[PDB]
Design a protein around this ligand. Structure first.
Ligand SMILES: CCOc1cc2c(cc1OC)CCN(C=O)C2
Ligand SMILES: CCOc1cc2c(cc1OC)CCN(C=O)C2
Ligand SMILES: [Mg+2]
Ligand SMILES: [Mg+2]
Ligand SMILES: [Mg+2]
Ligand SMILES: [Mg+2]
Ligand SMILES: [Zn+2]
Ligand SMILES: [Zn+2]
Lengths: 325, 323
């Protein structure tokens, strides 16, 4: 009956604040597989793209396995969370009938693969330690290039090509969109991505039906890039009991990186020094300089669809702030 | 060796006999030309590069160019190195670039096509190659050339940068990456636009020398410089240019045999049963090489007059071969 309790929890897949850690436990540490499968069924993607269900499950389980179970934050639970958050953002009223089925597939697939094989240290750490990854990718979006390469390579494993029935033009278009989306999750691109989102909000056009008007690739991919980026940075917008767990997990990852930097004689990265860190001040700063500027701008683009999410973010900022004095 | 030594005396001159140097050096033109340039520029002393580490690395690097690729081999690498070396001595660019910037442009030239398989980025992308899978279809070859060039520094006695400071090494690496990535032909138009912008807003001394204050402008010059050197074949003496044309067309035709034996859209100039070698050269000069070299000549006015003249002479000759 554990499967019955899991099915009950998956009924919330269209809701912000899904109990994703509960789903991870109830699914036997397969949150990415069950949430992806549920979303594909919900959006009729198996029928639309003629995806064999056995192929979908085989790919998802292989992809999920290539997330590191032994990293506290950038694991399969984070991947499932970003997938489900992207799924909700795609459903927003202001975007109804705006994106094609292929664009929706691209955004959800990009979210599922976007951190695969993440080692739990930052791009800068990989660059400064002369890692094989940084050498492979010439210090440029090192992790994000790797996540894409792994995500696409796994499609070639036995019974894993979930896109086997797409047309060549469909596969070509999907591949480009997925690459554009995942490379936009590099935090070094955040300021330019947000600057561009602000420009689009300030010049936004809406159709007679009231939804966003996006009539060229540049504008369409920019919205999908910022959507998945918002989903990636969505932990402080979630109910507090979820947000606090994500904070526990990112600080564990940061502190472990700082212990490796300290042992190597390197300067310790910001927020990574467990002897000189303020978890609470770091969260307020994170929200104030990164997460709220981004989500306030997204909320403007889809106004007023995201008002409840923005209100939760502001409440959680107030809560973490209140723990400082 | 004595004849090889005499040929190498032309190292500061446009139109070095690089094919002869390739013959006389035992197919080691990249090694001997790089060594000669490092001495001519006092780079070994300036950066405390042990001569035996320089030779070991250069030989390993040269070995990773493919001998069965007609154009993108070690002779082409040697030619781009030597061409960059001459462009760096342009009078309008005197006192522009630091020694580390000079080292970066020359090292970038040497590694800029290493391990080239003789097929284009589009071929690698459309064939779902391992390279394109690794590099997400984005500057596939150029990312690979860089990764190989840098990885070879870790071979036994190959770290020619071992005596650079940590900050010098980090700065060099960034500049080399920025330069080699700019050799991707899909970036040509943006790069040329930026070169034109710099021309229209150029600042000069009274003695006709360019003033490039910020790194962004300086890296753009070095990017366009190595790009110019990469595309310099039609600006060389005709006897050399014709040999380069033979070699690129062999490589293109062999790729076209593969877009046919596999069944793809045939890349331009790659169909041996429908190609006009001479028309292609004139079109290449008119749309790519001359717009680039005319803009560069304006930047360094008038120091590139002799080079732009040869280009126009060579274009006239190829046009005269068309009936
Ligand atoms: C509760 C989540 O908290 C954070 C998450 C992340 C950062 C910072 C965070 O808070 C200080 C930095 C960027 N990032 C990379 O993976 C995620
Ligand atoms: C004599 C050499 O001529 C050529 C060289 C190249 C191209 C075209 C050329 O002539 C038609 C295309 C770009 N490229 C790539 O490696 C080099
Ligand atoms: Mg795993
Ligand atoms: Mg990431
Ligand atoms: Mg791993
Ligand atoms: Mg090249
Ligand atoms: Zn992520
Ligand atoms: Zn080249």
């Amino acid at each position: 009956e554990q499967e019955d309790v899991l099915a009950k929890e998956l009924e919330d897949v269209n809701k912000w604040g899904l109990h994703v850690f509960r789903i991870a436990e109830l699914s036997g540490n397969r949150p990415l597989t069950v949430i992806m499968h549920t979303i594909f069924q919900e959006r009729d993607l198996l029928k639309t793209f003629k995806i064999p269900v056995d192929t979908l499950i085989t790919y998802l389980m292989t992809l999920e396995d290539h997330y590191h179970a032994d990293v506290a934050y950038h694991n399969n639970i984070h991947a499932a969370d970003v997938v489900q958050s992207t799924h909700v953002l795609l459903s927003t009223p202001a975007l109804e009938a705006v994106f094609t089925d292929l664009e929706i597939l691209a955004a959800i697939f990009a979210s599922a693969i976007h951190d695969v094989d993440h080692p739990g240290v930052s791009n800068q750490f990989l660059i400064n330690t002369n890692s094989e990854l940084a050498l492979m990718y010439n210090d440029s979006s090192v992790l994000e290039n790797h996540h894409l390469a792994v995500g696409f390579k796994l499609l070639q494993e036995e019974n894993c090509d979930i896109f086997q029935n797409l047309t060549k033009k469909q596969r070509q278009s999907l591949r480009k969109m997925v690459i554009d989306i995942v490379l936009a999750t590099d935090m070094s691109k955040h300021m330019n991505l947000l600057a561009d989102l602000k420009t689009m909000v300030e010049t936004k056009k809406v159709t007679s039906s009231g939804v966003l008007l996006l009539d060229n690739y540049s504008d369409r991919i920019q919205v999908l890039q910022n959507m998945v980026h918002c989903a990636d940075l969505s932990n402080p917008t979630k109910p507090l009991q979820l947000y606090r767990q994500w904070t526990d997990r990112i600080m564990e990852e940061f502190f472990r990186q700082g212990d490796r930097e300290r042992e190597r004689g390197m300067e310790i990265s910001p927020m990574c020094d467990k002897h000189n860190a303020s978890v609470e001040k770091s969260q307020v700063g994170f929200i104030d300089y990164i997460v709220h500027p981004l989500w306030e701008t997204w909320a403007d683009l889809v106004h007023p669809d995201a008002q409840d999410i923005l209100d939760t973010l502001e409440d959680n900022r107030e809560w973490y702030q209140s723990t400082i004095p």
